[PDB]
């Protein structure tokens, strides 16, 4: 919902029904097609596990395809000023 | 839009109409409500400008509210294993 601020003064936008814990590694705040700020806990870029690899050009590699690996993957690309320039849902299907 | 893979082999999910350039800061891959991988050009967390600040509990501070700051802000929170804990929208209304 709605948050009310006063023109010319500062404001803290609170994450609704949340408390920061040791298990949270990232918070992302976006507005429109712009990334505004991020909180990170770790130095390394995230990688879910050893079954995946991110290539040097940004492509995602799935190492040994499984029937449970099919479905929709969403890729989002941000420029150096925070603009979301590309967003795409990709349908990964099995050739059966 | 649709990528086809054979079971038992590796598959590359290519970002369509895309060439990794120097203006690209982040590439994020998600599968539903789970983060899978990310490319990050810089180690430091992103911050759009000095007008904003990310607090240590994850809340966003807008230091001096202007009329262009009203609107909807989206916050998404990820845990250590990539699960998206929350995805909420806040509407900022300004009093003068």
Swiss-Prot record, chains A, B:
Top-level lineage group: Eukaryota
Q: Which residues are glycosylated?
A: 74, 81
**Residues of the Ig-like V-type domain:** 1-96
Region: CD58 binding region 1; residue ranges are: 31-43
Which portions of this protein are annotated as coiled-coil regions? none
Q: What does this protein do?
A: CD2 interacts with lymphocyte function-associated antigen CD58 (LFA-3) and CD48/BCM1 to mediate adhesion between T-cells and other cell types. CD2 is implicated in the triggering of T-cells, the cytoplasmic domain is implicated in the signaling function.
- Subunit details: Interacts with CD48. Interacts with CD58 (LFA-3). Interacts with CD2AP. Interacts with PSTPIP1. Interacts with FCGR3A; this interaction modulates NK cell activation and cytotoxicity.
Q: What is this protein called?
A: T-cell surface antigen CD2
Shown portion of the complete protein runs from 26 to 121 of 344
